[PDB]
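Supplementary material to the annual report.
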Amino acid sequence: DIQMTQSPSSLSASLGQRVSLTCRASQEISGYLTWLQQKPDGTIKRLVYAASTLDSGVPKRFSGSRSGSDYSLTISSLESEDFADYYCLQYTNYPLTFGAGTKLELKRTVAAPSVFIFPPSDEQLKSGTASVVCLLNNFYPREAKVQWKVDNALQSGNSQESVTEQDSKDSTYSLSSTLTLSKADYEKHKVYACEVTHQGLSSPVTKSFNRG
Amino acid sequence: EEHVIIQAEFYLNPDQSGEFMFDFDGDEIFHVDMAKKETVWRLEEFGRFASFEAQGALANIAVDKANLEIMTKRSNYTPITNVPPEVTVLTNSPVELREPNVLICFIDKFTPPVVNVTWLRNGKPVTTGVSETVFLPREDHLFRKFHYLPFLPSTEDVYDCRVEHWGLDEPLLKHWEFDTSGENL
Amino acid sequence: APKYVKQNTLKLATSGGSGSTRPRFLEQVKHECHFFNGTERVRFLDRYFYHQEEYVRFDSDVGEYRAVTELGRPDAEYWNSQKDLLEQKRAAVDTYCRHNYGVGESFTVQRRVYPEVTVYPAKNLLVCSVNGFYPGSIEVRWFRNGQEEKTGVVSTGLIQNGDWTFQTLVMLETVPRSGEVYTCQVEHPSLTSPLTVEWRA
Amino acid sequence: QVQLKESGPGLVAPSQSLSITCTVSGFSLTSYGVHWVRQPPGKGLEWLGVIWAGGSINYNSALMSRLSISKDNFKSQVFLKMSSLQTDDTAMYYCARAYGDYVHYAMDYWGQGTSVTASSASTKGPSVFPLAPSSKSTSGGTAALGCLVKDYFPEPVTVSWNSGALTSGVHTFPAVLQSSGLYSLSSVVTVPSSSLGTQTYICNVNHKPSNTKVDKKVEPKS
Ligand SMILES: *[C@@H]1O[C@H](CO)[C@@H](O[C@@H]2O[C@H](CO)[C@@H](O)[C@H](O)[C@H]2NC(C)=O)[C@H](O)[C@H]1NC(C)=O
Ligand SMILES: *[C@@H]1O[C@H](CO)[C@@H](O)[C@H](O)[C@H]1NC(C)=O
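Predicted assembly:
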C-alpha cells in the first residue's frame, strides 16, 4: 500500500490570495495523481488529474504541478467558492490511496455574535426532560466561549455545542450550545442565563430568562 | 465565440518529434511535414486558395526545442504522465453491405503524443490503404488522433483498432463487426 | 496568392539548475485567435505550455504576459521587459489573427457541405443518422404523425470525423406501432429548406 | 447528463449484509468502470474496489473478501455487498466513473453519497420541539425562531423551512451524540421581527430511517 501524506492540514487564508497544498508519495506514483474538492455537503468534484491535467469545469486559477515525488495544487486568486476540503489521490496501482485532507478557511473581518436564548418547550417539559438552547449567530472567528450560569452558578456538564461550516455568502460561523436538565431539576431554579465571550465583543454578553 | 484559429506547435524529447499545424474550430487546416519540409493541407482543395512558407515553421520548432530544454532543466527533469488513450471505432456512413465505407479509429484524451496504431482485418495486420492524421491538439492540452481504413462491409470480416500507448499495460483492441455497428454508441 | 502568417515563438529565460521505458518531456505552444461577431472583436492568446500544464500566457485583453504557474514568472518578467516584443503581441489582433482570418474565410468560415440523412431501426428504437456536414450548427427534430416529439430524443452529440465533416445520430425511443409515420427534420446552414425523411411501419 | 447516485439501507444491524446500488445515467457501463469509495465520519477517504467495463474486478486486499461488486450493464447499475459488518464500517459510500479497463484511467464524476450505519440499536423517530421567538424587542429588528430535533437514531435528518421557500438566513446545526446514545440537533432562522405577526414559519423534518415526517409551526409567544 502506497502512503499519501498531505502537508497543509488546516490552512486558512484570505480572499484573492494564493495557497498551496503538498501531497507526497511513499513510493513512486509516476504522475498518476488527482486533486479532489469536497464542499461540506458531501459533493466531490474533480479539479486536476494525472498530476497537472486541468479538468473541464475548473478555472485557470487551479494548477497542479510535480517536482520529483512532490505534488502541489496551487489555487491562485482565492475566491469564495474555493473554500472547502481538498484531498489528493494516487491511482498508479491498486489499492487507490487518498491523502489526509486540507480544511481551507476564508479569513474575514471579525464579527460579533448576536446572542439569542430559548426557553424549553411545553411539549418537552411534559416528557420529563428539558433543554435550553443558546444560539450565537453570524460570528467570526470560530473561536468563542459560551458558559451556562443557572441561578448565578457555573454549570459544567450537560453542555454540548455544535458549530456550522463557514457560510458561502457572509463567511461566518454559527454555534448552538444546548443545556439539558430534567423536569425535576428545571423547576428547582428561576434564572437561567447564557454568557458569551468572543473577540468581537468588548465584554461578555449575557442573555437570560426568569421562567416568566 | 464564433470561430477560433489556433497555431499549435509542440516538441517532444528524447524522441525529437516536432509538430507545426493550424486549427480551425477543431479541424486541421494544414500542418508542416518535418521530414519533407512542405505544407500539408488536410483537405487538398485548400492549397488552391492559400499558401504558407514551411521554412518559417522550422525556425519556430527550433525555439520550441530550446524552450523545452530550459523547461526540463527548470523542473529537475520532471517527466510527463503517460495519460492513457480513449478509443472508439465508428464508420463514416451507416454500414450497408457491399457499399464503399471507411472505418475511423478515434484516439482521444492522451499524452505523450506518441502512439502505435495498427488496423487488423480478421486478426491480421492491414498493410496498405490506411490514412492517419497528425496529432490534433485538445483543449485540456492532451492530444487526439484519427486513423482511417476504407473498406467494403461484409459479414465475413471483423476489424480491430490496435492502439498501443505508454499509459497502458497491454495493447487496446476495439472490435468492430457488421452485426454490432451502433452497439458502442 | 493569399499567404498565412506565422506567430513567432519566443525563447524562454535561461534560469535553472540541473539533475538527472525512457522518460519523455513535452513542450507545447498554442498561438490561438478568438473571433466574435465575425471579425469585430478578436482576442489573441499567445500561450506557452510544459507537458499538459500552462506556464505563461499573453492575453490581448490584458496587454502583457502573465504567469499561469510559478515556474512561468521568470519568463513573464523577461518578455514584458522587451518593449518592442509587447507591441507586436498587442498588434497581433490585426497583424496575424485578422490577416489569417481573411486568408481562409472562403474555405473555412464559408464552408458548407450538405448532410446525408438516413433512418433505420436497431437495438425497437429508431435512428436518424446525419453524416458528412459542415459546419456543426445543426438541429434535428423527430415528428410522430405530424406532431413533434420532444420526449425520447437521445442525441449522440456532434461527432467529429476529422475530415472537416461531422456526423451525429439522433435516436427516438418510440414503439414503432403500425401505420404511424415518423419524420426526421434537419436544419443546417448548407441547406435551402429543411430536409425531411419519413418512415412508415 | 453524466450522473451517478447511490442508494441503500440507512440502518444495517451488525453481522449482516450491506447491499448498495449505484444507478448511473449519462454513460454506458459497457465503456466506463465504476469505483467504490467510503468516508468514515470525520476521517479521510478509503478506496474499496472497482469493476471495470469488461467486468474485471479489483478489490482492496484489506477487506478480506467481505466485498462483492457486481454489475448489470443493461440495467445500468452497479452493486456492492459488504459482509460481516462491524461498527467500524459506519461511513458514507460513494461511487465514481472511470474509462476503460485500466487503473491509469483517472476517475472523474462522483456520486452524491449514501450514509450507512452499522449498530445493533433500533431506529427511533425524532421528537420535534419548537424554539419560540419570545424575547422582548429582540435587538433592532431581528428575531430568532427555530426547531429542536431531539432523540432520534440514526442519522441523517433533513430540515426545510416553509417547505423550502424560506432559505435566506437559515442555519441547521450538525447533530451531536447525546448521553443516551441518540442524536440531537436544531435549526434556526433569522427573520425580521416586524414579520412575526404576518408570516407563518413552519419547519419540515424528514427522518428517512424511521419514515418520520413532522411539520411543526413555530408561532411566537411574546
Ligand atoms: C511502439 O512499438 C515499439 C516496437 O514494438 C515499442 O518499442 C519497444 O518498447 C519496448 C518496451 O516497451 C522495448 O523493450 C523494445 O526494445 C522496443 N522496441 C523497439 C523496436 O524500439 C514502443 O514502446 C511502442 N510505443 C508505444 C507508445 O507503445
Ligand atoms: C456586430 O458588428 C456589427 C458591425 O458589423 C454591429 O453593427 C453590431 O452591433 C454588432 N453586434 C454585436 C452584438 O456586437
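The helical segments of chain D are 138-141.
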